[PDB]
Design a protein around this ligand. Structure first.
Ligand SMILES: Nc1ncnc2c1ncn2[C@@H]1O[C@H](COP(=O)(O)OP(=O)(O)OP(=O)(O)O)[C@@H](O)[C@H]1O
Ligand SMILES: Nc1ncnc2c1ncn2[C@@H]1O[C@H](COP(=O)(O)OP(=O)(O)OP(=O)(O)O)[C@@H](O)[C@H]1O
Ligand SMILES: Nc1ncnc2c1ncn2[C@@H]1O[C@H](COP(=O)(O)OP(=O)(O)OP(=O)(O)O)[C@@H](O)[C@H]1O
Ligand SMILES: [K+]
Ligand SMILES: [K+]
Ligand SMILES: [K+]
Ligand SMILES: [Mg+2]
Ligand SMILES: [Mg+2]
Ligand SMILES: [Mg+2]
Lengths: 523, 523, 523
């Protein structure tokens, strides 16, 4: 197609207009006084959300150059959501601030590559200062506070996440699902969790979360992969006459002759998904046997000789809920037999008593941790479906932030940590003047989250920013109560990973964005 | 697609405009003096209805932001219809009042999230006050009055519902369907009822009620889960030559090889449906045997060896009417043999006498209650099809309200109960001024049902609202007779569940709606 | 014509949009860091100006309701220019701030008439506090500083105005006119001034300043008004021979048979003007004789018997420059014998030495002061005509501000005085809550000039406003040097009359404007 080509300042102002549209839409949601955004879905009711990445993902502009700017800066929130699950609004605000100040510097006639290098140096130094400024969440013991802050000042959600991490361990697996009542419920049930994903992007359910949910699925287990398709036809026919979705945890499946011909088979009545199995060799068969014992199923094998044609539905496993995601697939509740589960736990405990080699010992301890800890499940309570989606998003953000806090630590929330690390970087210099100006651009942009948090409250961002910069340490401004204090003491804690990731992704995209002289799009 | 993005007050007034359009169209139907709405159907005659959820579901607007507001506020009536089957107009009126007053508060600079928190606190307290204010319907014995009020002051419908609850029990199963004469008839007929639904959303008939109906279907029973189709294909041919539509009762059926195959089979001449079987193991076998004995059919099993290829038409069961709904599937009339039904009842009563375990005793007495009570069927009498649909909707509302009244209790109707709980909540306070204003918004919005009822009468809502607020207890205003008095004495009784659910759903959706600052839709 | 009629919030937001357009255009010119505005003139080159009233007068919008808002706010700058000649930008900024905050209060549901009453009470108390806070310019002796501040930090203009006030007296008459060189010159020249204006609105010359200028005019004097204009037709032809514009100083002249016939005669080549004579009886004859002795002319009278037909051009007087304005008509250099002027001055001095009546003595002191002081003419030096107009506007503003300072006093500039009076009015209360909110609206708007000055500097207005409010007395913010200090010491002095007038006119118009509910215009 014929291309529209824009050069220099006209292109940059159109790109900034697109970034400004996306970033305003995202930034109205920042902080405790941040408001909600309604996203239109032609497939049903609109979704009300405070999540920055959802608003960012929905944004697309009519103007092609402004749309290019919007997609460029939407990458920031996408990466922030994918890496930490929180801070997408903060990442978008930081990216917009860097883009605005860097374009102001480019309009002042300075080299944007050196501006990008200065921004990169300042952000590397600020990541180091964030690591130094971080406080371990085990020492502080504020998992509930992190979850409360990340759930938009919801003490119930944070306390529930803290209880779940107390039940299954801070390294345990917690899954959020839609509840049935109007109140949030937590149950510690028996289920598995593996870092495995689907082999086909067309297996995604109607939700756009990327993780398909199965209502009482049917588990199929096989450590070997038979070449012929026709031998699998009796099993597929038995599952089709059954009414539980088929999840296959076998040793990697292709869509050349199974998923494609199934796409032409049904129109999407009941979803069937297959995923890999973590590990290999004896370890893979061991965990496959563990899954089969959990769900009451069996594992076929060449040595056993039990062929899939002779397998029945009663021989196969059964579960109550399975969430399949690219990052991690979890089995929420496989019934099986509780006595069988306890016996397998005792047998694997005897195995770890017998085992002595370090790798086998550590994988066996991972197995016993997965079996004993189980899975915590949070059923979100909400009177309606729109409230359900909003609260579930908040609970998922709280879970991600608590995970990031136990993984990497915490810093002062409310944008105070970025203010402190920018104050600590006031003497950082580059190789020339443009690099120094890029450093100053990054350091000024580090104040943007706090300023936007204050602006959402209706207060004056500059006065509060100056008052916070005057203070030292964890001194900042509770926007919920509109008063200053030690942000750790008042429980406004950000994950260190969330802040670091937001800063890094905003910096990378925005520093690349300020270096553009020409933009080429369609007409 | 390119997105239109609106911010702040412009977005909020567009959203309020859409909510106002939907809520006006719904609110014209509120109360005894409420009028009817004609909904256009491209297929067949238009539908005249006084039901709030039908008018709400038909609403869709040209403006995308107004349509988005309409969809969110339509979720209120959808949830109210799904949860109680009544009060959708009251729920819409409450939601519109909360949205209006909350948007007025947001225009006054008040924090909308704390306004939502205040509304939530006030509505939780009001639900507690409604539970306290509730009077049991067994003590009052006004099931006929509840049905009469819920059928728009139709004494005959309420008396018919009361007679049905007297015949089959207040826990008995009552189904409403089209009659043949001009008068409404009650028939206590033998039939079954289970809390199970269709496994495919594509089995829905041309009516949009969600519950398909079968005109003299053919009942098929199966317990063992066979694999192949070609062994069951002769049964499909036998039913497809027998002439009556097929209803299969089994544990669980997918749609990869059956539902899509049956979709590709015919163009929609005769419907074939399958349903789930509640319980498992011996209990499922027991209920399948009961269904087979009721319809004269037989249940296949692996132990019996009654292979489906040998099954004939006389061996299978037959019924006169079956209603398949997601919440509950009922068999209105299975002929079978009356002597066989009585013998099975005597045998299961002997099982009652023999059994001693609490779970077996309770499930077996549930079985004998289902068998002895039977199904009450209400033949709606109307001279035309449009009157048939309107009266059937009114009788369905009456049935739902009587069920809610026996389940949860009754309160003073005409919006009096919400007025009383608002008066009782006058001293409720929140954490800050925003939360207090949200509480006051909810309390003023709880006067809206009574005011709309009065406005539909052509009277002055403020005068009647003040007069009712002056009174105490069940003192309210009969809008049918346009005079004040004790609401319980005049028989104006609302279900407690209906009022509580309407308030809760209106509050949740409206409080979420008032917190929106940006709105994103298509162009 | 058919009328468009808007009601309530739609009309108010249209009004506010028009106000915002006009006020943004005016407010870009506020302070020492304020920029210029180009006003397009079809009749020649565009005008570059920093004067708020010129930008305000040029503004007219396509939208009719926005145009009404713009016109009503433009009234503020027009009144401020007419009353003090300075502070029009400050008046516009104050009016816009009052309108914005008052419309916010009106949108909060408050009675706008009570808001207007509160604003009026706050502004009355504030002008009382400004009178209390005022420091006499005689005690301070900072006329040069006031002129420098009012000329946009031009030391030369302020020094020239101070020298002119030192030469002809602070009550003396100073006129600004276009020079011929590139530098500003001060000339003390024998001339008169009277508090009289032109009798016809059609006498305005090509400049739209409202004051016409005459290049070497011809002065005619007349104490009595003859019946027919045809007697002076020989004098009219004698004037029409010599190309000097005719300025007639008489008691009073109509335009039925003199102005209209001369407009029917002349097409706009050379202007003939007339003025009124202050005083009556002997005083008018005395001042006419004084003017005649200045210009070397003669005064006609009935007792003298000197008829205009016998009068010649040499008998009549003439001048070098005459400026005719509605408020005051000035004669710059009447062409007459200096020795005759000195002899007349001595004779009049002997007249005070003889007279004893208080009214006669005071009018004779006025006469000798007018004669001896003379007129101080400032020739503005600029390389081009656009720079000439800009500098002449700045010098006129400086002259007006110095006159206002010697009349009413000075206060701290930079919006500091309004900040101090708003701080001193923090305990002012009205008759109800809406009046208190109006008072608070006025007090918040009193911060607007300083905030707009700082925003024009590119700094943060909130931080500087808070820092100034923290200080006491004349402590404020030198915006030229970007640093705080005592602004009386730093030389940033505002006239008390200028600040008081700006506040009063902004308050009157804006308080009336917030009370609108319907707007009626054309289609
Ligand atoms: N009470 C509070 N006072 C001050 N700052 C707060 C308070 N509660 C939370 N914050 C801060 O607000 C930010 C979180 O806002 P928000 O959750 O809306 O955005 P986010 O975490 O950047 O991203 P997302 O939209 O994905 O949740 C963090 O910087 C957090 O420290
Ligand atoms: N005679 C009456 N006098 C006063 N109020 C009455 C009378 N009859 C019914 N009502 C009240 O009118 C309301 C019922 O109106 P209506 O049935 O039209 O709407 P709904 O129950 O909210 O929902 P839906 O449209 O789904 O039926 C209840 O609040 C009921 O108490
Ligand atoms: N160096 C300075 N520092 C701070 N404030 C200053 C300084 N110089 C002038 N000001 C202030 O700026 C204002 C004058 O601005 P400006 O002359 O542009 O507008 P104005 O007086 O409102 O009217 P106009 O547009 O008619 O001149 C006064 O409040 C004056 O005290
Ligand atoms: K957010
Ligand atoms: K209704
Ligand atoms: K100005
Ligand atoms: Mg967050
Ligand atoms: Mg009803
Ligand atoms: Mg000025």
């Amino acid at each position: 197609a014929a291309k529209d080509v824009k050069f220099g300042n006209d292109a940059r102002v159109k790109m900034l207009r697109g970034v400004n549209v996306l970033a305003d839409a995202v930034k109205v949601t920042l902080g405790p006084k941040g408001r909600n955004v309604v996203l239109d879905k032609s497939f049903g009711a609109p979704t009300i959300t405070k999540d920055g990445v959802s608003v960012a993902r929905e944004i697309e502009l009519e103007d092609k150059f402004e749309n290019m700017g919007a997609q460029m800066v939407k990458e920031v929130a996408s990466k922030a959501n994918d890496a930490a699950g929180d801070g997408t609004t903060t990442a978008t605000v930081l990216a917009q601030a860097i883009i605005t100040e860097g374009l102001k510097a480019v309009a002042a006639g300075m080299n944007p590559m050196d501006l990008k290098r200065g921004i990169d140096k300042a952000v590397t130094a600020a990541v180091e200062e964030l690591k130094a400024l971080s406080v371990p969440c085990s020492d502080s013991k504020a998992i509930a506070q992190v979850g409360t802050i990340s759930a938009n000042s919801d003490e119930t959600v944070g306390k529930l996440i803290a209880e779940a991490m107390d039940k299954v361990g801070k390294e345990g697996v917690i899954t959020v699902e839609d509840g049935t009542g109007l109140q949030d419920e937590l149950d510690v049930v028996e289920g598995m969790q593996f870092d495995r994903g689907y082999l086909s992007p067309y297996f995604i359910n109607k939700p756009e979360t990327g993780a398909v949910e199965l209502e009482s699925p049917f588990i199929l287990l096989a450590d070997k992969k038979i070449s012929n398709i026709r031998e699998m036809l009796p099993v597929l026919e038995a599952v089709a006459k059954a009414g539980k979705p088929l999840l296959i945890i076998a040793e990697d499946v292709e869509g050349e002759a199974l998923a494609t011909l199934v796409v032409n088979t049904m129109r999407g009545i009941v979803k069937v998904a297959a995923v890999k199995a973590p590990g290999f060799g004896d370890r893979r068969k061991a965990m496959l046997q563990d899954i089969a014992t959990l769900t009451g199923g069996t594992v076929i094998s060449e040595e056993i000789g039990m062929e899939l044609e002779k397998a029945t539905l009663e021989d196969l496993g059964q579960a109550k809920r399975v969430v399949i995601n690219k990052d991690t697939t979890t089995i929420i509740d496989g019934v099986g037999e509780e006595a069988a589960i306890q016996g397998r736990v005792a047998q694997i405990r005897q195995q770890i008593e017998e085992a002595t080699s370090d790798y086998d010992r550590e994988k066996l301890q991972e197995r016993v941790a997965k079996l004993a800890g189980g899975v915590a499940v949070i059923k979100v309570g909400a009177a309606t479906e729109v409230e359900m989606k909003e609260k579930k998003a908040r609970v998922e953000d709280a879970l991600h932030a608590t995970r990031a806090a136990v993984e990497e630590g915490v810093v002062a929330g409310g944008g105070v940590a970025l203010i402190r690390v920018a104050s600590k970087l006031a003497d950082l210099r580059g190789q020339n003047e443009d690099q120094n100006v890029g450093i100053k651009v990054a350091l000024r942009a580090m104040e943007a989250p706090l300023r936007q948090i204050v602006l959402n409250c209706g207060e004056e961002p500059s006065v509060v920013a100056n008052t916070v910069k005057g203070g030292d340490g964890n001194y900042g401004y509770n926007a919920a109560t509109e008063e200053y204090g030690n942000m750790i003491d008042m429980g406004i804690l950000d994950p260190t990973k969330v802040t670091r990731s937001a800063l890094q992704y905003a910096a990378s995209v925005a520093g690349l964005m300020i270096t553009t002289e020409c933009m080429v799009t369609d007409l």
